[PDB]
């Protein structure tokens, strides 16, 4: 199951998947996260990126794909 949001973009809509509570987190322990409220996405310095994958190797619901 998966809880989504239609984003109004003139007149084109972006459909977006939400996240969890464990991974958003897992988001705001990391220094350099920046959330955008437009798009619903959070972005981050490549500084932070093995922080990332290693405390989500830890959740068990959830699973990045490395970039």
């Known amino acids: 199951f998966l809880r989504g949001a239609c984003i109004k973009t003139g007149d084109r809509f972006r459909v977006k998947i939400g996240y969890n509570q464990e991974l958003i987190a897992v988001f705001k322990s990391l220094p350099s996260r920046h959330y955008d409220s437009f798009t619903k996405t959070w972005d ?6 093995r922080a990332l994958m290693k405390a989500v190797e830890r959740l068990s619901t959830v699973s990045l794909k490395p970039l």
């Open 44 to 49: 981050f310095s490549m500084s932070d990126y």
